[model samples]
Target: MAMNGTITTWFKDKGFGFIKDENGDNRYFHVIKVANPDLIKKDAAVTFEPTTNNKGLSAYAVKVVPLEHHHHHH
Candidate 1:
């Protein structure tokens, strides 16, 4: 399942970073997931699914979503 989160600590130049999950956990991710150094900035919102990767979890199918976009009630 995809979970919503925002970039917690992304090393833009390093091409790797962590995103904060709903439970206040830092999930590991790499540029390979985001599918961007330029766009994957800190505090950027995105949706992803993390799977077990040994001891730590890595995010997959990571796609950046709209940042605080309004979807007014219909």
Candidate 2:
């Protein structure tokens, strides 16, 4: 099943990071797994499918969730 999470940590040079879900569980992700690495930032929301390995959860087919811009009326 797919899950939603926020990027807790990112290593731009290394191209990897850990994402924490609502339950506070973490998953590893690499830049190659993301649709656009440039869009990735700490605390950015994302969706992904997880895979289990010896270390624990790793993310795949990751996508950054776009933040909606709301114009405030003066």
Can you write out model 1's per-residue Cα lDDT over 1-74, one digit (the tens) per residue?
Answer: 67888777767678766777776766677777774333534465777775544376545666776554434443
Give one digit per residue, the lDDT tens place, for model 2 in 1-74.
57888787888889777877655666677778886555445466778776554376655677877555433344
Candidate 2 local lDDT, residue 53:
47
Candidate 2 clashes between residue pairs 3 or more apart in a chain or in different chains: none
Q: For model 2, give the 10-residue run with minimal summed lDDT.
A: 65-74
Error of 2 at 14 (Å): 0.2
lDDT agreement with native, every candidate: 0.64, 0.68
lDDT of 1: 0.64
